[PDB]
TrEMBL record, chain G:
Keywords: Electron transport, Membrane, Mitochondrion, Mitochondrion inner membrane, Respiratory chain, Transit peptide, Transport. Accessory subunit of the mitochondrial membrane respiratory chain NADH dehydrogenase (Complex I), that is believed not to be involved in catalysis. Complex I functions in the transfer of electrons from NADH to the respiratory chain. The immediate electron acceptor for the enzyme is believed to be ubiquinone. This is NADH dehydrogenase [ubiquinone] 1 beta subcomplex subunit 2, mitochondrial. Complex I is composed of 45 different subunits. It is a peripheral membrane protein. It is found in: Mitochondrion inner membrane. One of its GO terms (cellular component) is respiratory chain complex I. Belongs to the complex I NDUFB2 subunit family. The gene is NDUFB2.
TrEMBL record, chain J:
Mammalian complex I is composed of 45 different subunits. It is a peripheral membrane protein. This is NADH dehydrogenase [ubiquinone] 1 beta subcomplex subunit 9. It is found in: Mitochondrion inner membrane. Belongs to the complex I LYR family. Its main location: mitochondrion. It comes from Sus scrofa. The keyword Membrane applies. GO terms for biological process: mitochondrial electron transport, NADH to ubiquinone. Transmembrane segments: none annotated. The gene is NDUFB9. Residues 129-158 are annotated as: Disordered. Residues 7-65 form the Complex 1 LYR protein domain. GO terms for cellular component: mitochondrial inner membrane; respiratory chain complex I. Keywords: Acetylation, Electron transport, Membrane, Mitochondrion, Mitochondrion inner membrane, Phosphoprotein, Respiratory chain, Transport.
From TrEMBL, chain K:
It comes from Sus scrofa (Pig). It is a single-pass membrane protein. GO terms for biological process: mitochondrial electron transport, NADH to ubiquinone. It comes from the Eukaryota. Belongs to the complex I NDUFB8 subunit family. Keywords: Electron transport, Membrane, Mitochondrion, Mitochondrion inner membrane, Respiratory chain, Transit peptide, Transmembrane, Transmembrane helix, Transport, Ubiquinone. Accessory subunit of the mitochondrial membrane respiratory chain NADH dehydrogenase (Complex I), that is believed not to be involved in catalysis. Complex I functions in the transfer of electrons from NADH to the respiratory chain. The immediate electron acceptor for the enzyme is believed to be ubiquinone. This is NADH dehydrogenase [ubiquinone] 1 beta subcomplex subunit 8, mitochondrial. Complex I is composed of 45 different subunits. Its main location: mitochondrion. It is found in: Mitochondrion inner membrane. The gene is NDUFB8. The chain holds residues 63 to 186 of 186 of the full protein. GO terms for cellular component: mitochondrial inner membrane; respiratory chain complex I.
UniProtKB/TrEMBL annotation, chain L:
Coiled coil: none annotated. This is NADH dehydrogenase [ubiquinone] 1 beta subcomplex subunit 3. It comes from the Eukaryota. Accessory subunit of the mitochondrial membrane respiratory chain NADH dehydrogenase (Complex I), that is believed not to be involved in catalysis. Complex I functions in the transfer of electrons from NADH to the respiratory chain. The immediate electron acceptor for the enzyme is believed to be ubiquinone. Belongs to the complex I NDUFB3 subunit family. It is found in: Mitochondrion inner membrane. The lineage of its organism: Eukaryota, Metazoa, Chordata, Craniata, Vertebrata.
Length: 182, 64, 60, 128, 173, 459, 71, 122, 182, 172, 124, 43
């Protein structure tokens, strides 16, 4: 229904993952390779690896629900992206995602310590965790297609209301400080 | 024409007065516009002293 | 949000450390806290990212 | 199944599981019946001035004026000195003031004794 | 320019010789060349016309000197007139010494940017120069209070050799 | 001076014998003209204070206040001339007489060379203000408010009078010059302790300091607008001018004794701004806001370091021009709705578009963004206070965080919201109001370019 | 009032699609792959790990300078 | 690497602690180990504005890299052979490090199994 | 001292021109958004030039100008620092803000205060530019507070939305806690 | 007023169905689970004892309250919705137009002239609305929040000005 | 019923239940829709705290005590083994950077007069 | 009904959408690698 907008979304989502030789690769998995080859805080390293895999997870949710499925919007469809301003704006940025990762990396002077000699197994973990994240997130998202009755998991609850953060943060000290004020 | 007059009254005349500001006004004051020295390499001569910088000696043929 | 809260205003925080990077390396305790803070921030925001039902929240 | 939703001063109990609407007697219906009536008198009155073309002024809410009085002037004349108020005055008042006094004085004594011996060095600190 | 290198030492530049082996043209030459012929040249033309217009009617200005006056170390106690002459001179000496630190700070800041990456060791002479200025300025003016006066400055000064006399006498043993 | 004091005095017979309706015109003409003349004193020489006569002299601290007071005089005229246009000619003439007289005392006080002459006129400002708050006030609590303001200021000022004459008998002359060049070490002793307390309490009450401040929420709120400015925009700084001059002799006893005042101001400023977080009267909101800013000046004076004195004057001038602005803002609504409750008139940007913009920069100046003079003052004190003690940045910044919430709070509650349904008498803002607001904020943002003029006597 | 709507609304039906959006989407969705394989062919070593990691165990004590247990 | 598991879960004695290694004299047991040298002399090394963390022994494989990168501008796709040379040379000094890391590792159980060896029979 | 000094500094001056032009009302009220976009586009293409001497010459600038105050022994004055992080961030920021400004025309084609909205965006860009181009910590604070307040208005752009002010209040609240360390 | 049981159970059905919308997502899954939800409601419909009905409600409300989606789907043009009062900041009241300058007043002669007709119509009918109220007030003040209509001809409905002349939901 | 007579000066002001304006029926007609408030209804003593853009007491789906237990658990759970990551840091089978010219003492801000003790690296 | 019937039927799979444009992307490679081979043979 929205070819160019969907096309741009896939490009942007893939950049979030860091597909090789694309804009995402020239920064992100270079960091993950860099963070592996360092004296890090052990538990700090693991969380990023869980995080970068988690980057693909919500990325599927965007592509899965919004595009890959049957329509669910109100009946009167007003889908339209033919406006030149919309096309030109996305087009200008979209070429910046296909390129400018190679362009900047080559153009900038080489001035960082290069991690050249790593054992193979952690060299491409960024591709593993994303593909692993891609595979299971798709299966779990497609599990919604199954007619099975849903059971509200308490872990899902913790994630959905933002780690219970807003209702303690944005309710308790605000009340206490304002209560002390009056 | 709209683009041409735009360049004159938004690109030409602004950089004109900044150039005057950054060529005679501030430049008459020391240590107001300072840059890192042009990073030179052994090899190419320096324009002012006219002396080729002594190039390094042999590398131990560390070819792939 | 597409301009400010995506790539041009929230960048200020990380950019500040980039300006003071030469003074960053001398200390060892604080720089560990930076990678420590980034680690928890990555998971918790991503952990709350997946289970959201609004397109704007997911990108945020 | 899943044990119940205990409330809190910040997370109040919703009306969808409150026993009040799930156990009702005729007396409760009688009391809540004309709750609209007392609100209707307020609403019908307020609508009458609001929709009045001749009304070219602001409509004063006596509840709102009462609230400003209750928060500003009707406090000290209604204040009664009691140990609860007396202790809270000291605990929220002179208490923290001495607390900061002890913290700052100790730091100043710490700082003053240290540079006297020669511990802290401000070879580059000049402006102060 | 409008100053001397002895006050603002700027080491002579070291510019390389651009010799691009690659056949494709260097664009940065082209934008620089068009910049000179489209912006820089009219700016210079206006400037020289401005400079000669100034040169037609030359009005001069000189610089104010303050002859040395007796300071507060020889000022008699309760001598209000010599109190004022000494106090004003000391505060004038305060302002110039403040500018002395100001100059050294500018040189140190120039030391950083000019060396770029090599700021740490190339001009450590600037760092020790500021170390001497800042340390001496500390015992000279620092901690004098918002109501600093030449009497207070002697009071802080007198504390130094008095402590120094005790130390050296202890050191001599 | 004589060159500003005499024109100020000569405005008094001019306004009295002026034309029936031209009183507001002519008084505004020359009061602006006199302010232009007072711009001449903004220049200061190298270190010696600008001295004209034996009784009058100026320095790099009095002159920035002198221009502020004389520049203020036109502003009270236009702001008050809205409601004053509905009474007798003599009554209106009596008001302009009283503002002219009140300003006259302020100009002569700030340039006073003898400390006794300073005290006489410093306390003499009570009479023009006291009658302003009482006679022309628009409430009932003004009667109690006027008594609170008069008695608090006088109860502290009287020990100063006894203390001041004591210096005269013991040390000799009390000229601000001879005091400075003949400063003697005030050694720690119980008699000197009360000497220190007497010479300080008088100026502390008029700051006001946390605890000796309950006169401000009563005086400022109940006062008429022509007054509501000066009790917040100039004469609070008059207590400030007293501190920075009288502390010339109070060394080194000040650092040993300053601790109760520092803790009271440094901790109370969090509490005072906490009142602003939950308030019901817009005038009271700004009033308690002034206490927090002045409390920051209170701590600033007592470190007695070059940076603190600069940030003291910078905030002192900037807050006065700011707090005067907000009182104009609250005045405009209070005339249209005839009430001071905040929630009554929610929604003004929808109806008054530029009033929101003026409210935006007004609440922004109090928010003290860089490089606004409010920020250039508070930031200087924070660095000076931090050098004194590292812990104080917890308290100093906490207000800076807290002050953001309430300073934008009336912006949200009044401007940013649905317009109140029942109110129907809001009118398009008169060009007097907008012109007055520009007269407040344009010098403030213009002053940002050259803070050296207002930076104090230690630049 | 006036026109200017190249598209038209659809009720419970596939919305009208024009030429410009379709091949514009196809071009960039295809050239993204063109970049993917072209750079892969030229620079497969970057993702592969061009430089091998030697196995520590195979390094014998001789070039390691490890004098044997007899001493 | 896998040594981390053998250091924490396993006995940490057998495994080095990169904070303080080397501990025993590296020259001990090494017959005339060859002294490292660098062609890039310091003043030109400082001239190149070369970052401290990039000032290793193989840092002279940058000076030509920047030189070609400077001169070959605007061609950025060029300067690949010498760039690969630097990375390959970054390989060499890097593999040098796990040689001494392994040597420290291998001398660890060497000394330790000796410690109970010449002490158990007595 | 090449054009890299003057030309890179005028980029900000091009950006602030629409802000001054707004109050004079000489701008045609219909085509103000077009005025803003092509102005940023001109600044963007002008901001490309600082890049070319960055890879070619490898030079960086520090531009100090008019003295603010000679406060004691410090020389607080306006000053800018061109460097690796700066000379490329503005081209990226300008390219991004140009693309969205073109997009903003199509999306916000019905807001009656559209001229005001584009005015806010330029002001944010000016505050962000001086944030990334700052030599003294005080100038860094100018942007550090300029972007924060600019976010507050822009978040509460829809004004009457009751919860929008809460987020607007939230944005400044969390920012002020951040400014504690600053 | 007093919300009777048959209304409250309908409120549960409407709200619970909207909640499983946030759960079921896919339309075919919705239509299946809705039918089970629908018929499972109708299976117990012969309870002559009203107490048992509340007893059936004694577990349903908690069933809803723990099975509710933590991020339920609400349409934007509603409380909690993303577009709630989004366009409110343009709802300028119509009485503000009386303060327009004559130059702007003359800019739209037709609308302003018709505004005068409405203002004159409101002025004439106001007192007509007023006596209509006390002609049929319930003994003891207004009992219900409802508002009686215009009983006779030539009379506008009582208290009609604000409802009729309210700003449009899409003012722009 | 008025507030408890703690002597706090509340007076006879009604003790309305501590319920924020967020807990109002939006579809019900409100004379002050931005506050969901009618006319003359005695407003809460702390209205300026429970107002729409402030502290809201709307019921969260999950219980407040469980809300605290999970949040307080998570931060402590995550922080506690952030520390155990530090006591067991992750490093690679590689020694320290063998740096030239005695750890670049001259270039590392060292005193030229103070000759650095010989730090030289060899082949391995 | 319409949410499944009509043109809204036969929606591509997740992975299938990921390789959108690969049908022509591989063809772009073939002609590109052919030019590289021709340039390689030319040298
Ligand atoms: C050469 C000259 C070029 C033109 C200069 C024009 C002016 C200018 O921009 O100067 C820049 C100069 C810059 O100084 P500079 O050191 O950069 O040198 C100037 C020359 N250039 C710029 C080329 C290097 O700064 C100032 O002049 C400061 C301006 C401050 C303005 C303050 C206005 C206050 C108004 C108050 C009104 C209300 C009074 C009553 C209330 C008072 C408060 C309580
Ligand atoms: C070594 C490498 C490890 C790599 C691990 C990668 C994990 C990626 C994330 C998987 C879990 C999240 C997921 O799959 O989310 C998608 C989906 C959303 O389901 P939901 O939000 O309930 O919506 C249903 C609508 N009908 O389906 C779901 O099931 C959502 C589940 C929500 C809770 C996820 C908790 C993840 C915890 C990860 C570890 C955190 C630290 C310990
Ligand atoms: C590391 C630990 C750091 C400290 C943790 C503190 C947790 C609490 C933080 C408060 C969050 C900000 C806040 O006030 O939020 C309340 C509210 C927004 O509520 P929200 O859930 O977004 O709902 C809005 C409507 N839908 O927004 C509002 O109510 C806005 C209007 C009132 C604002 C009052 C703010 C008072 C804040 C006082 C804080 C004092 C303690 C600070 C402690 C940390 C100091 C560094
Ligand atoms: C409303 C209550 C007071 C509010 C706060 C006011 C400020 C607090 C301090 C109060 C005392 C102010 C009066 C100070 C007088 C001048 C102080 C001075 O210069 O110091 C003298 C010290 O001043 C005093 O001795 C008097 C002041 C101390 C307090 C005693 C009197 C004041 C308290 C009671 C009256 C005021 C309280 C209100 C009563 C209703 C030095 O003289 P000396 O004692 O060294 O004399 C020479 C020789 O040694 C012996 O004389
Ligand atoms: C097939 C397994 C690939 C590696 C998976 C785990 C990656 C993270 C742990 C290893 C990190 C680098 C080595 C350490 O040290």
């Amino acid at each position: 229904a929205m070819p160019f907008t969907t096309t741009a979304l896939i490009i942007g989502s893939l950049a979030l993952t860091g597909m090789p030789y694309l804009t995402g690769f020239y920064s992100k998995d270079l960091i993950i390779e860099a963070v592996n080859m360092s004296y890090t805080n052990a538990w700090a390293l693991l969380m990023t690896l869980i995080a970068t895999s988690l980057t693909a997870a919500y990325s599927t949710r965007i592509i899965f629900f919004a595009f890959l499925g049957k329509p669910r919007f109100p009946p009167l469809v007003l889908i339209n992206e033919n406006n030149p301003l919309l096309i030109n704006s996305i087009k200008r940025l979209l070429i910046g995602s296909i390129f400018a990762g190679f362009i900047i990396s080559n153009n900038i002077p080489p001035m960082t310590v290069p991690n050249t000699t790593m054992p193979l197994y952690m060299k491409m973990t960024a591709l593993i965790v994303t593909i692993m994240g891609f595979m299971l997130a798709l299966e779990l998202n497609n599990t919604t297609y199954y007619l099975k009755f849903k059971y509200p998991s308490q872990t899902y609850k913790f994630s959905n209301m933002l780690g219970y953060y807003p209702s303690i943060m944005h309710r308790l000290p605000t009340y206490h400080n304002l209560s002390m004020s009056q | 024409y709209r683009h041409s007059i735009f360049a004159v009254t938004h690109v030409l005349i602004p950089v004109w007065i900044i150039h005057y500001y950054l060529k005679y006004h501030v430049t008459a004051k020391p240590y107001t516009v300072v840059e890192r020295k042009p990073r030179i390499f052994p090899g190419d001569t320096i324009l002012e002293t006219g002396e080729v910088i002594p190039l390094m000696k042999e590398f131990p043929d560390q070819h792939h | 949000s597409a301009l400010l809260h995506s790539s041009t205003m929230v960048v200020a925080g990380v950019f500040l450390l980039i300006r003071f990077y030469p003074l960053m390396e001398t200390n060892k305790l604080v720089q560990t806290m930076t990678l420590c803070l980034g680690a928890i921030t990555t998971l918790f925001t991503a952990l709350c990212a997946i289970t959201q039902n609004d397109i704007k929240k997911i990108v945020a | 199944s899943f044990p119940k939703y205990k409330p809190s001063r910040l997370a109040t109990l919703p009306a969808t599981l409150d026993p009040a609407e799930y156990d009702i007697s005729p007396e409760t219906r009688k009391a809540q019946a004309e709750r609209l009536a007392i609100r209707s008198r307020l609403k019908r009155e307020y609508l009458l001035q609001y929709n009045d073309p001749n009304r070219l002024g602001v409509i004063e809410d006596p509840a709102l004026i009462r609230w400003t009085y209750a928060r500003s002037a009707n406090i000290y004349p209604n204040f009664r000195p009691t140990p609860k108020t007396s202790l809270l005055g000291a605990l929220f008042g002179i208490g923290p003031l001495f607390f900061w006094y002890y913290v700052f004085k100790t730091d100043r004594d710490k700082k003053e004794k240290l540079i006297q011996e020669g511990k802290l060095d401000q070879t580059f600190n000049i402006s102060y | 320019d409008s100053w001397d290198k002895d006050v603002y030492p700027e080491p002579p530049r070291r510019t390389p010789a651009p010799a691009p082996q690659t056949s494709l043209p260097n664009p940065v030459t082209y934008l620089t060349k068009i910049f000179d012929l489209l912006v820089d040249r009219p700016v210079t033309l206006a400037r020289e016309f401005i400079e000669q217009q100034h040169a037609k009617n030359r009005y001069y200005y000189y610089h104010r000197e303050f002859r040395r006056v007796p300071d507060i170390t020889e000022c008699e106690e309760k001598d209000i007139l010599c109190m004022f002459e000494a106090e004003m001179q000391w505060r004038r000496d305060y302002k110039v010494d403040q500018e002395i630190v100001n100059i050294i700070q500018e040189r140190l800041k120039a030391c950083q940017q000019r060396e770029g990456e090599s700021y740490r060791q190339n001009c450590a002479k600037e760092l020790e120069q500021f170390t001497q200025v800042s340390k001496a300025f500390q015992d000279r003016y620092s901690d004098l209070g918002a109501h600093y006066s030449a009497r207070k400055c002697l009071a802080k000064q007198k504390q130094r050799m008095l402590a120094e006399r005790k130390a050296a006498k202890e050191a001599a043993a | 001076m004589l060159k500003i004091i005499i024109p100020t005095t000569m405005l008094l017979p001019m306004t009295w014998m002026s034309k029936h309706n031209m009183i507001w015109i002519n008084a505004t003409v020359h009061s602006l003209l006199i302010s232009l003349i007072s711009l001449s004193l903004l220049n200061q020489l190298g270190e010696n204070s600008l001295n004209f006569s034996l009784t009058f002299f100026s320095d790099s601290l009095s002159a920035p206040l002198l221009v502020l007071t004389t520049w203020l005089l036109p502003l009270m005229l236009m702001a008050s001339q809205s409601h004053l246009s509905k009474e007798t000619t003599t009554r209106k003439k009596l008001y302009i007489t009283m503002l002219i007289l009140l300003q006259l005392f302020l100009i002569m006080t700030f340039t006073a060379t003898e400390l006794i002459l300073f005290y006489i006129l410093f306390e003499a400002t009570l009479v023009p203000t006291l009658i302003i708050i009482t006679r022309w006030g628009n409430q009932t609590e003004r009667l109690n408010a006027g008594l609170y303001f008069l008695f608090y200021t006088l109860a502290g000022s009287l020990p100063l009078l006894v203390a001041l004459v004591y210096i005269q008998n013991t040390t000799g002359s009390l000229n601000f010059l001879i005091i400075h060049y003949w400063s003697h070490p005030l050694s720690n002793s119980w008699s000197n302790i009360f000497m220190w307390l007497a010479c300080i309490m008088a100026f502390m009450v008029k700051m006001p300091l946390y605890g000796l401040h309950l006169w401000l929420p009563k005086a400022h709120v109940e006062a008429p607008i022509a007054g509501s400015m000066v009790l917040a925009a100039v004469l609070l700084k008059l207590g400030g001018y007293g501190m920075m001059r009288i502390t010339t002799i109070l060394n080194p006893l000040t650092n040993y004794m300053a601790y109760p005042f520092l803790m009271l101001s440094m901790w109370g400023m969090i509490m005072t701004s906490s009142i602003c977080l939950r308030q019901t009267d817009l005038k009271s909101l700004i009033a308690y806001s002034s206490v927090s800013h002045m409390a920051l000046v209170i701590v600033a004076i007592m470190i007695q370091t070059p940076w603190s004195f600069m940030g003291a004057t910078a905030l002192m001038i900037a807050h006065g021009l700011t707090s005067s602005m907000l009182f104009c803002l609250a005045n405009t609504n209070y005339e249209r709705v005839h009430s001071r409750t905040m929630i009554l008139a929610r929604g003004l940007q929808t109806l008054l578009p530029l009033m929101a913009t003026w409210w935006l920069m007004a609440s922004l100046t109090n928010l003290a963004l860089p490089p606004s003079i409010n920020l250039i003052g508070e930031l200087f004190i924070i660095t000076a206070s931090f050098s004194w003690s590292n812990i104080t940045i917890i308290l100093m910044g906490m207000n800076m965080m807290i002050t953001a919430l309430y300073s934008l709070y009336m912006l949200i509650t009044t401007q940013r919201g649905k317009y109140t349904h029942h109110i129907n008498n809001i009118k398009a803002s008169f060009t007097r109001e907008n012109a007055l607001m520009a007269l407040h904020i344009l010098p403030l943002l213009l002053l940002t370019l050259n803070p050296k003029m207002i930076l104090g006597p230690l630049y | 009032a006036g026109g200017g709507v190249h598209i038209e609304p659809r009720y419970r039906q596939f919305p009208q699609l024009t030429r410009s959006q379709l091949i514009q989407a196809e071009f960039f969705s295809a050239t993204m792959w063109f970049w993917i394989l072209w750079r892969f062919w030229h620079d497969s070593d970057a993702v592969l790990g061009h430089f091998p990691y030697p196995d520590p165990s195979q390094w014998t004590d001789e070039e390691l300078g490890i004098l044997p247990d007899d001493e | 690497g896998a040594h981390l598991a053998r250091r924490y879960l396993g006995d940490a004695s057998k495994e080095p602690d990169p904070l303080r290694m080397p501990t025993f004299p590296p020259d001990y047991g090494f017959p005339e180990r060859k002294e490292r040298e660098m062609v890039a002399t310091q003043q030109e090394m400082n001239d190149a504005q070369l970052m401290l963390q990039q000032r290793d022994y193989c840092a002279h494989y940058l000076i030509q890299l920047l030189k070609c990168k400077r001169d070959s501008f605007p061609n950025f796709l060029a300067c690949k052979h010498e760039q690969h040379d630097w990375d390959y040379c970054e390989h060499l000094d890097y593999v040098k490090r796990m040689k001494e890391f392994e040597r420290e590792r291998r001398l660890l159980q060497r000394k330790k199994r000796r410690e109970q060896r010449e002490a158990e029979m007595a | 001292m090449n054009p890299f000094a003057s030309l890179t500094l005028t980029t900000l001056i091009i950006l602030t021109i629409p802000i001054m032009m707004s109050n004079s009302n000489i701008y045609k009220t219909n085509l103000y958004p077009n005025y803003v976009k092509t102005t940023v586009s001109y600044a963007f293409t002008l901001s490309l030039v600082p890049l070319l001497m960055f890879m070619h010459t490898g030079q960086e600038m520090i531009i100090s100008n008019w003295h603010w105050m000679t406060l004691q022994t410090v020389e607080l004055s306006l000053s800018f620092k061109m460097d690796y992080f700066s000379v490329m961030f503005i081209p990226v920021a300008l390219f991004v803000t140009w693309s969205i400004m073109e997009f903003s025309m199509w999306y916000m084609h019905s807001d009656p205060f559209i001229n005001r909205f584009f005015k806010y965006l330029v002001l944010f860009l000016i505050t962000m530019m001086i944030l990334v181009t700052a030599n003294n910590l005080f100038q860094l604070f100018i942007g550090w507070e300029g972007v924060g307040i600019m976010s507050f208005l822009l978040i509460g752009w829809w004004h009457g939305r009751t919860d929008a002010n809460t987020a607007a209040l939230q944005a400044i609240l969390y920012n002020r806690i951040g400014d504690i360390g600053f | 007023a007093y919300l009777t049981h048959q209304q409250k159970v309908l409120r549960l059905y409407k709200r619970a169905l909207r909640h499983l919308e946030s759960w079921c997502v896919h339309r075919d899954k919705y239509r299946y689970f809705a039918c089970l939800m629908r018929a499972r409601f109708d299976e117990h419909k012969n309870e002559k004892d009203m107490v048992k009905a509340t007893q059936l409600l004694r577990q349903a409300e908690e069933e809803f309250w723990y099975g509710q989606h933590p991020q339920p789907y609400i349409f934007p043009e509603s409380p909690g919705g993303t577009s709630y009062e989004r366009y409110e900041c343009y709802k300028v009241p119509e009485w503000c137009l009386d303060d327009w300058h004559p130059s702007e007043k003359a800019m739209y002669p037709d609308y302003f002239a018709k505004r005068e007709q409405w203002k004159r119509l409101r002025r004439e009918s106001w007192e007509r609305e007023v006596k209509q109220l006390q002609e049929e007030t319930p003994p003891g003040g207004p009992r219900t929040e409802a508002l009686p209509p215009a009983r006779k001809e030539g009379d506008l409905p009582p208290l009609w000005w604000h409802i009729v002349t309210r700003p449009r939901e899409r003012p722009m | 019923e008025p507030y408890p007579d703690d002597g706090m000066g509340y007076g006879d002001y009604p003790k309305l239940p501590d319920r924020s304006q967020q807990e109002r029926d939006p579809w019900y007609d409100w004379d002050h829709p931005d506050l969901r408030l009618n006319w003359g209804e005695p407003i809460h003593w702390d209205l300026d705290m429970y107002i729409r853009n402030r502290v809201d007491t709307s019921p969260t789906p999950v219980s407040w005590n469980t809300m605290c237990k999970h949040l307080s658990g998570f931060v402590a759970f995550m922080l506690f083994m952030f520390w155990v990551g530090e006591i067991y840091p992750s490093y690679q089978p590689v020694g320290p950077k063998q740096y030239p010219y005695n750890d670049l003492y001259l270039e590392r801000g060292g005193d030229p007069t103070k000759e650095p003790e010989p730090v030289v690296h060899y082949e391995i | 009904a319409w949410r499944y019937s009509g043109g809204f039927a036969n929606n591509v799979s997740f992975v299938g959408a990921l390789l959108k444009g690969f049908k022509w992307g591989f063809a772009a490679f073939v002609v590109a690698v052919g030019a590289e081979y021709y340039l390689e043979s030319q040298n």
